[PDB]
Design a protein around this ligand. Structure first.
Ligand SMILES: CCCCCCCCCCCCCCCCCC(=O)OC[C@H](COP(=O)([O-])OCC(O)COP(=O)([O-])OC[C@@H](COC(=O)CCCCCCCCCCCCCCCCC)OC(=O)CCCCCCCCCCCCCCCCC)OC(=O)CCCCCCCCCCCCCCCCC
Ligand SMILES: CCCCCCCCCCCCCCCCCC(=O)OC[C@H](COP(=O)([O-])OCC(O)COP(=O)([O-])OC[C@@H](COC(=O)CCCCCCCCCCCCCCCCC)OC(=O)CCCCCCCCCCCCCCCCC)OC(=O)CCCCCCCCCCCCCCCCC
Ligand SMILES: CCCCCCCCCCCCCCCCCC(=O)OC[C@H](COP(=O)([O-])OC[C@H](O)COP(=O)([O-])OC[C@H](COC(=O)CCCCCCCCCCCCCCCCC)OC(=O)CCCCCCCCCCCCCCCCC)OC(=O)CCCCCCCCCCCCCCCCC
Ligand SMILES: CCCCCCCCCCCCCCCCCC(=O)OC[C@H](COP(=O)([O-])OCC[N+](C)(C)C)OC(=O)CCCCCCCCCCCCCCCCC
Ligand SMILES: CCCCCCCCCCCCCCCCCC(=O)OC[C@H](COP(=O)([O-])OCC[N+](C)(C)C)OC(=O)CCCCCCCCCCCCCCCCC
Ligand SMILES: CCCCCCCCCCCCCCCCCC(=O)OC[C@H](COP(=O)([O-])OCC[N+](C)(C)C)OC(=O)CCCCCCCCCCCCCCCCC
Ligand SMILES: CCCCCCCCCCCCCCCCCC(=O)OC[C@H](COP(=O)(O)OCCN)OC(=O)CCCCCCCCCCCCCCCCC
Ligand SMILES: CCCCCCCCCCCCCCCCCC(=O)OC[C@H](COP(=O)(O)OCCN)OC(=O)CCCCCCCCCCCCCCCCC
Ligand SMILES: CCCCCCCCCCCCCCCCCC(=O)OC[C@H](COP(=O)(O)OCCN)OC(=O)CCCCCCCCCCCCCCCCC
Lengths: 48, 48, 105, 41, 80, 175, 120, 110, 98, 347, 171
């Protein structure tokens, strides 16, 4: 996706450390469909 | 300093009571001018 | 007037709720346990004045772990570029982001 | 200094206290009997 | 201290029952032998993962498999 | 549409306070604060804070706002309102509440999506289900730890509630 | 200022290192002035309750003097301790940073030029 | 999700029954009636006792709000502290009740 | 900063502006004050659940209980005012001008 | 009031202030302020008259608004720091909110508009508590958060407090409102020197509490609430006549009295930090406080004397009132200046 | 900052255990008994390294030993196991306490045809020791060096030179 945008390191971290960061819900399910996002982030809460 | 003394008395003549506001605003604008010259701090940074 | 009675007598009245990295029930971690632990171990005992300017990297990593403003900025940038490319018709989404790939486990 | 807005201000009382009924129902015919009740709570 | 007790049991049996139940609720958890088993069951209930240890070489009290002799056993809980 | 639901409730929550910060009456003020408490409770419940949302209902709304409506109803002497037949007594209520939901749907316009879409939270905001927790609500065990860890907190809280009882009974005496 | 010093050992009125300092003498002018304040409190106490000011309550005036001297002795010990801590931290920070405190080259007035302003 | 659908269906059935209960007899052209109780034009006097029992409800309801996580706090490892604080909260609720007793707070609605 | 936190802060400031411009009644003041307390509960709860910081989950309940007790105190004050004047009007509370 | 209930409530006031003083956690700071307010509300309503209910209502509204602003500052700190240590604040928005909230709890201007009212509505011992004991907890929080306090904001609040506490003392015959405007001026004095040397903040606080406690104890010993009622002191108890007025000459700030001890030391810490204009202006306004309070001194030790005939009966009865620590507090509020370097104990 | 080094898709592919959760819960205690060693070496690597990217192959060892757990059920005792996990699978909370005769049949057939002993109550929650040849992580948080502390105070405490030095006070 990020070809036309200059100054873009792909996979660039926002943390200055190299320790493994537990990924946020949008780092995983960001570029996906809305129903999978709903089942990911309100599935347990809305479950009956 | 003398020019802002004239400016303070000019602000005092359009304030009224007349000569007292002349002298007060002239001395206050004089202190503003002297604070701009000698670098007088009213909200001085804590340094020691 | 900070009469530190809790260090004089040796009682723990409110230190346990103070930070996230303390002893939690059933050893539950916080979301930013490592980042807060590193900011605390960096800035320990050296005072606030040295702690502001000499532990700014760990503190900004911990602030960005809390608020996730740089991560939300990056995801908004990538999602905006993706929306613009889907609008222009120069890009197609993969099958594993459209929902036809029979997820991993 | 009594100004224009302060001239009607009377001084407060000396012991700082200031000078400050009960319910009356009509149980009507709604045998039959009407009851006027001075009740106190 | 006994005629007063009969008097308050005659007049107000509700408050006598309340203070008796509250007094027993205070004193009886210490006078009981089964109180320690509450502590033992609540500390032997595994809500987390039992994170294993790296074998440095000299740890006789720590087993290598769950079906080993050494280790904290719950024979008392199964039997009681 | 369904994704932004917490945000939607928050918007309604803000609008709920404009129901009663403009202060039409203390009674309608209590009514607006009850509706605001319900929608803020919906915000709480949609992060997995089930016990805290039920403390909003049981203690804030059903415990305290009952007392606010009770003390308000023992003041502010009432007066009748419009009581024509059903083209006024319920029809104006339904048209007014339909205009209220029209106002709710009316604010989601072009001045809103410049804030919504540039700062998209839904997709990456609600992260309470980030991994597994186990056989326990973490929020339930954190509230449960009030008795083992919160000894000083429970002491000063129960002492403040006892002093609250004593203080109310001393100031509400008149003697 | 010095609250980082009394943060590793809180609520100590007199630390153990304060015992390395000389205590105030019992003929301290400050301590005798605090005893004078006790005598003044005794005279004011016999005055405001309409007692004969010098005569009545000599045990009471004696306890006023004794209580002020007793509190003031420890206040003077803590005063001496805090100014000793102030000078000790000052001298340690001067010794630990010579580059921030250079020795100024003292010039005699045969080199130092001062502009003379005549008074007439 | 199912809970919100159920609340919405209960609210819709409630509003539908209220709307039927108001609009179905307003088909009738019965009579426009005139000429509008134990008081006619009396104001409301305040009663201190009703407010005392309302604030007593609120303070004991706060004490109950503290007592609510006890079925979860029974599962903890520090049972001696947990038992002491549970008994201390219920004892402070009882001390608040005894102080409400002896200062005549529970009188004429006892 | 974030978005839903900005909304809860917006509600807090709106109930603050209602708490800083009195119209007629003291009950309106207490209602705006408890709307402020409600928004503090909501915002504290969303922070504490967001970070998964477990021991602070008892904190909003604490933030409820004290402050609800606080509201009880305020209600009692209003009642004593309404026992002196008959109304809870804030313009009857002006005897301390002198 | 039941005296056991009075002892319990006063220990609860002291307990709330102690919980604010000793706690490392923000929730316990907030809890201590809530406990302090909840317990001090019946102290104001000790006499059960409408002015006390009005005073307690105004006090409840202001202190409750300050408590909610304090909790919002704590919540914003938990956003931008994820923690709860009572230390510096990690957002200047939370810093501004906590500074405003503590200025409301102290009654610093422009949040001063409740201090002369409430002190007028309540008795003299409750006004003594409101103007001595209730300053200790927000000044302690200001002592603990000073690496985050904005300089311009605290100086603005300080000089505005000193000017408004100065010009409030002109038009007053009430002793309690004069003590309230003196309170506002001295809180401006305390928060002037806070970001430069907080030892002088604690020195000003202790000297202020000693002088205020001496003045309220004299007002309770003579049972006088107005200037005109204070004017009869020369004929009833002549030893009471001057002690009020040498204590008030101290409260103005005037050498060789010990009330000159704070302000001078404050100037002594602000000319170090190159601020010459600001202590000059603040102590000129302190001379304006001397102007009005010296007019009250002329009122009592001089001209407006005359008595009434019923005073002749009061000559046949001494004061059986407890004048607790009044000789001690009268000596400590005038003659402490030769012991000015005692201030090192407040580090 | 540095580019986060995510492993490739070919470095993540493994033969999954594609069975449902009631199949896993019916086969849980024998899995904890017989698949102990690669599971505990994996979770020791997982809590020591604090990074799944360095815990891949051991994880695949888990996914190498789980399938050989189920194949050895599928060759010998697939039918008592199927009858057992169907009754486990019926319940909403998936109770062990509703399925005791199918549990006894599965444990009997497993102890006969394979010789596996179902563990006692109290044993799978044990902390065990794990022998590994992989090294100990010297810095699993990837932290840099701590700033140096302030120099502490020392030496005998001397009196203050000429008192307080406050304008004219000689003590
Ligand atoms: C000493 C000074 C403090 C004395 C306080 C008490 C004074 C008193 O009671 O006097 C009455 C008493 C005599 O009275 P009496 O015979 O019992 O009969 C009662 C009278 O008839 C009284 O008649 P009455 O009560 O019926 O009314 C008459 C009326 C008549 O008055 C009026 O009508 C109105 C008043 C007149 C106008 C105002 C005058 C001035 C007022 C203000 C003064 C301020 C000056 C302070 C400095 C300036 C800064 C403010 O009032 C008075 O006369 C007032 C009585 C007290 C007069 C003295 C007041 C002193 C206290 C205030 C000043 C000192 C403290 C502040 C110091 C600040 C820093 C320097 O006088 C004394 O006893 C004086 C003391 C004499 C001996 C002193 C020995 C000192 C030894 C020290 C060393 C030994 C100890 C060592 C200790 C350490 C060991 C290790
Ligand atoms: C350390 C700091 C201490 C701060 C002050 C603590 C006490 C004040 C708060 C409680 C209170 O009101 O106590 C009443 C207070 C007297 O104040 P008052 O009611 O205004 O006095 C009126 C007449 O004196 C009452 O006369 P009376 O006719 O009732 O009978 C004689 C009475 C009877 O008293 C006795 O019998 C006491 C002996 C028995 C005690 C209990 C045993 C059980 O004796 C006295 O009260 C003589 C006055 C005692 C001295 C008062 C001031 C003490 C010094 C305060 C700190 C000064 C620092 C100056 C620093 C200057 C440089 C910065 O103290 C006592 O009664 C006991 C004094 C114990 C002193 C201990 C000193 C060492 C402490 C370590
Ligand atoms: C073998 C074993 C036994 C051996 C025994 C050995 C000892 C035997 C003798 C025992 C008794 C010793 C007594 C103390 C030693 C002498 C202290 C002394 O004179 O210091 C000189 C001191 C400085 O002179 P220096 O030449 O540098 O020192 C000579 C010595 O080497 C001074 O040495 P230094 O370097 O240590 O000086 C210390 C330092 C030196 O001072 C400084 O560094 C500067 C600070 C001085 C105070 C400045 C404050 C200014 C603003 C406030 C002013 C308030 C109003 C003034 C008074 C108005 C009336 C109340 O003092 C202070 O900082 C404390 C304040 C001054 C207290 C002096 C002692 C008073 C005890 C009795 C009090 C009675 C009331 C007196 C009047 C109250 C005010 C003092 O003089 C003054 O400051 C003048 C003020 C008056 C001094 C008091 C004279 C003591 C005797 C008074 C008896 C008559 C009382 C009459 C009734 C009440 C008054 C109406
Ligand atoms: C499931 C729970 C129970 C549900 C509700 C019960 C089910 C049946 C609901 C409808 C019942 C019949 C209509 C309401 C009763 C009307 C009675 C009446 O007075 O009617 C005269 C009224 C008016 O008659 P009128 O013109 O003689 O007026 C009388 C009044 N004066 C003379 C003074 C002017 O009739 C109507 O308003 C017509 C109503 C609808 C008629 C039926 C249409 C179809 C309905 C299906
Ligand atoms: C009156 C107060 C009665 C209760 C006192 C505390 C009882 C208790 O459980 O103490 C142990 C508890 C905690 O001990 P613990 O035994 O639970 O310790 C185990 C360790 N933790 C807590 C991490 C699981 O408290 C203390 O030890 C110190 C706090 C109380 C200090 C005294 C308060 C007095 C208040 C008076 C007002
Ligand atoms: C006129 C009487 C008051 C003047 C007081 C000034 C004393 C002083 O130290 O001045 C130096 C200070 C200057 O402070 P400064 O020394 O920091 O100045 C900048 C530094 N130099 C000179 C090196 C560039 O003068 C003032 O501040 C003058 C204003 C005084 C306050 C306003 C008075 C208004 C009228 C009453
Ligand atoms: C009369 C005083 C009696 C004092 C009894 C002992 C009290 C005590 O232990 O105080 C400790 C305190 C020094 O403790 P410190 O850690 O310096 O305080 C930090 C301040 N924020 O010590 C002090 O502050 C000493 C001075 C106290 C003065 C109080 C009355 C004025
Ligand atoms: C230590 C254990 C824990 C204790 C705390 C928890 C208790 C739980 C119950 C809480 C009750 C709260 C309210 C209690 C108020 C007590 C005071 C009281 O009621 O006095 C009045 C009453 C006289 O009755 P009267 O005034 O007429 O009643 C009005 C209607 N007719 O007077 C009475 O009726 C007398 C009541 C007091 C004496 C009761 C004695 C009961 C003894 C039972 C056996 C021993 C129990 C061991 C503990 C000792 C308890 C004293
Ligand atoms: C680093 C420093 C840390 C902090 C240091 C310590 C700070 C102490 C602050 C003290 C504030 C005290 C406020 C007043 C006391 C509180 C309780 C009270 O009000 O007691 C007075 C009591 C009430 O009796 P009552 O019957 O209500 O009288 C009214 C008429 N019926 O009785 C009376 O009214 C009798 C009249 C005399 C009362 C005198 C009380 C003086 C108390 C303060 C002494 C001076 C301050 C302490 C020492 C210096 C330290 C700053």
């Amino acid at each position: 996706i990020m070809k036309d945008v200059p100054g873009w390191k792909v996979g660039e971290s926002v943390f200055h450390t190299t320790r493994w960061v537990t990924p946020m819900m949008g780092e995983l399910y960001g570029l996906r469909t809305g129903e999978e996002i709903l089942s990911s982030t309100y599935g347990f809460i809305w479950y009956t | 300093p003398l020019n802002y003394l004239i400016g303070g008395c000019a602000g005092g003549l359009t304030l009224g009571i007349g000569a007292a506001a002349c002298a007060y605003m002239g001395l206050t604008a004089a202190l503003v001018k002297m604070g701009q010259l000698e670098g007088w701090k009213v909200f001085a940074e804590p340094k020691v | 007037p900070f009469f530190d009675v809790q260090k004089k007598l040796g009682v723990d009245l409110d230190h346990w709720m103070t930070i996230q990295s303390a002893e939690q029930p059933h050893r539950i971690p916080a979301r930013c346990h490592a980042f807060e632990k590193e900011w605390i171990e960096c800035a320990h005992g050296i005072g606030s004045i040295r702690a502001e300017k000499e532990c700014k990297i760990e503190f900004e990593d911990f602030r960005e772990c809390l608020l996730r403003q740089k991560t939300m900025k990056r995801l908004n940038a990538i999602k905006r570029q993706r929306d613009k490319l889907i609008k222009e018709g120069k890009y197609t989404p993969p099958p594993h982001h459209s929902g036809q790939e029979d997820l991993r486990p | 200094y009594p100004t224009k807005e302060t001239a009607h201000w009377k001084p407060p009382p000396w012991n700082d206290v200031d000078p400050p009924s009960n319910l009356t129902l009509n149980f009507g015919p709604q045998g039959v009997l009407r009851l006027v009740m001075e009740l106190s709570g | 201290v006994a005629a007063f007790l009969k008097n308050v049991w005659a007049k107000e049996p509700v408050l006598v029952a309340s203070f008796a139940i509250a007094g027993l609720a205070v004193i009886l958890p210490t006078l009981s032998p089964y109180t320690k088993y509450s502590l033992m069951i609540n500390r032997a209930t595994p809500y987390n993962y039992p994170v294993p240890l790296r074998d440095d070489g000299n740890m006789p009290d720590v087993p290598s498999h769950p079906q080993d002799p050494q280790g904290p056993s719950l024979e008392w809980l199964k039997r009681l | 549409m369904m994704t932004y639901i917490v945000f939607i409730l928050s918007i309604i929550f803000v609008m709920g306070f404009v129901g009663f910060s403009s202060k039409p009456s203390p009674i309608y003020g209590g009514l607006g604060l009850i509706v605001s408490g319900g929608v803020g409770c919906g915000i709480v419940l949609n992060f997995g804070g089930s016990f805290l949302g039920l403390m909003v209902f049981l203690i804030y709304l059903g415990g305290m706002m009952v007392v606010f409506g009770y003390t308000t109803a023992m003041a502010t002497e009432q007066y009748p309102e419009v009581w024509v037949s059903n083209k006024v007594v319920l029809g104006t209520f339904i048209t007014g509440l339909l205009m209220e939901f029209l106002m709710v749907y009316y604010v989601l316009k072009d001045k809103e999506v410049e804030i919504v879409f540039k700062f998209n939270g839904m997709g990456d905001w609600v992260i309470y289900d980030t991994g597994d927790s186990g056989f326990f609500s973490e929020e339930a065990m954190g509230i449960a730890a009030l008795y083992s860890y919160g000894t000083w907190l429970v002491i000063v809280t129960g002492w403040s509630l006892l002093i609250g009882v004593v203080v109310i009974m001393e100031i509400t005496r008149g003697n | 200022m010095m609250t980082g010093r009394q943060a590793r050992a809180p609520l100590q009125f007199l630390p153990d290192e304060a015992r390395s300092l000389p205590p105030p003498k019992l003929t301290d002018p400050r301590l005798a002035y605090i005893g004078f304040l006790g005598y003044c409190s005794g005279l004011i106490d016999n005055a405001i309750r309409r007692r004969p000011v010098l005569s009545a309550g000599l045990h009471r005036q004696f306890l006023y003097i004794t209580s002020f001297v007793f509190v003031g002795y420890y206040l003077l010990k803590r005063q001496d301790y805090m100014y000793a801590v102030r000078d000790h931290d000052m001298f340690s920070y001067i010794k630990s940073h010579p580059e921030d405190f250079p020795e100024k080259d003292k010039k005699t007035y045969r080199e130092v030029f001062e502009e003379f302003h005549p008074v007439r | 999700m199912n809970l919100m659908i159920t609340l919405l269906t209960n609210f819709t059935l409630a509003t539908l029954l209220v709307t039927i209960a108001f609009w179905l007899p307003q088909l009738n052209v019965y009579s426009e009636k005139t000429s509008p109780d134990p008081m006619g034009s009396a104001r409301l006097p305040f009663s201190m006792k009703f407010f005392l029992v309302a604030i007593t409800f609120l303070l004991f309801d706060l004490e109950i709000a503290l007592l609510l996580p006890l079925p979860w706090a029974s599962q903890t490892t520090n049972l001696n502290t947990m038992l002491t604080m549970a008994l201390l909260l219920i004892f402070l609720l009882a001390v608040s009740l005894a102080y409400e007793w002896t200062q005549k707070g529970l009188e004429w609605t006892e | 900063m974030s978005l839903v936190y900005m909304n809860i802060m917006m509600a807090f400031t709106v109930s603050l502006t209602g708490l800083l411009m009195y119209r007629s009644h003291l009950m309106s003041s207490l209602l705006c004050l408890e709307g402020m307390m409600l928004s503090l509960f909501i915002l504290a709860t969303l922070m504490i659940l967001n970070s998964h910081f477990t021991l602070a989950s008892m904190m909003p309940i604490i933030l409820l209980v004290f402050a609800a007790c606080e509201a009880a105190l305020g209600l009692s004050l209003l009642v004593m005012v309404s026992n002196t004047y008959g109304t809870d009007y804030v313009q009857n509370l002006n005897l301390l001008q002198c | 009031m039941n005296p056991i209930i009075l002892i319990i409530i006063l220990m609860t006031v002291m307990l709330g202030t102690i919980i604010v003083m000793i706690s490392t956690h923000w929730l316990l700071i907030w809890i201590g302020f809530e406990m302090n307010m909840l317990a001090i509300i019946p102290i104001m309503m000790k006499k059960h008259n409408p002015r006390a209910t009005e005073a307690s209502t105004k006090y409840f509204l202001t202190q409750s608004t300050a408590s909610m602003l304090l909790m919002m500052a704590i919540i914003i700190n938990l956003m931008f720091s994820g923690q709860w240590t009572v230390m510096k604040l990690f957002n200047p928005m939370a810093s501004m909110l906590m500074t405003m909230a503590l200025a409301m709890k102290l009654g610093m201007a422009p949040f001063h508009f409740w201090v002369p009212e409430v002190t007028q509505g309540i008795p003299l011992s409750s006004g003594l508590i409101l103007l001595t004991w209730q300053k200790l907890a927000p000044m302690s929080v200001l002592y603990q958060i000073l690496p985050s306090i904005n300089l311009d904001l605290i100086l603005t609040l300080s000089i505005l407090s000193i000017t408004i506490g100065g010009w409030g003392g002109l038009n007053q015959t009430q002793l309690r409102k004069i003590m309230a405007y003196s309170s506002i001026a001295h809180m401006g004095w305390m928060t002037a020197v806070l970001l430069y040397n907080p030892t002088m903040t604690l020195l000003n606080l202790i000297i202020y509490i000693i002088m205020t406690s001496t003045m309220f104890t004299l007002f309770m010993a003579n049972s006088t609430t107005t200037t005109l009622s204070l004017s009869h002191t020369w004929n009833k108890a002549p030893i009471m006549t001057i002690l009020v007025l040498i204590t008030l000459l101290s409260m103005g700030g005037l050498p060789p009295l010990s009330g000159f001890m704070p302000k001078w030391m404050i100037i002594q810490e602000m000319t170090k930090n190159d601020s010459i204009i600001l202590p000059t202006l603040m102590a000129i306004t302190a001379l304006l406080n001397l102007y009005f309070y010296m007019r009250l001194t002329y009122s009592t030790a001089l001209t407006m004397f005359p008595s009434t005939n019923n005073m002749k009966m009061k000559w046949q009865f001494p004061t059986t009132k407890r004048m607790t620590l009044l000789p001690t507090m009268t000596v400590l509020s005038t003659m402490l200046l030769p012991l000015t370097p005692i201030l090192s104990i407040l580090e | 900052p540095g580019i986060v080094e995510l492993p490739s898709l070919e470095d993540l592919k493994v033969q999954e255990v594609k069975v449902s959760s009631s199949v896993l819960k019916a086969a849980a205690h024998h899995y904890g008994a017989q698949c102990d060693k690669p599971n505990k070496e994996f979770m020791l690597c997982r809590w020591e390294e604090k990074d799944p990217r360095r815990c891949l192959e051991e994880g695949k060892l888990v996914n190498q030993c789980a399938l050989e757990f189920f194949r050895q059920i599928k060759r010998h005792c697939a039918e008592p196991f199927t009858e057992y996990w169907t009754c486990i699978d019926y319940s909403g909370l998936q109770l062990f306490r509703r399925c005791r005769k199918e549990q006894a049949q599965f444990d009997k057939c497993v102890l006969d045809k394979l010789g596996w002993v179902r563990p006692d109550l109290g044993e799978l929650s044990k902390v065990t020791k794990v022998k590994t040849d992989r090294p100990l992580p010297e810095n699993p948080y990837h932290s840099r060096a701590r700033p140096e502390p302030n120099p502490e105070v020392e030496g005998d405490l001397k009196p203050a030179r000429h008192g307080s030095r406050l304008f004219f006070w000689t003590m």
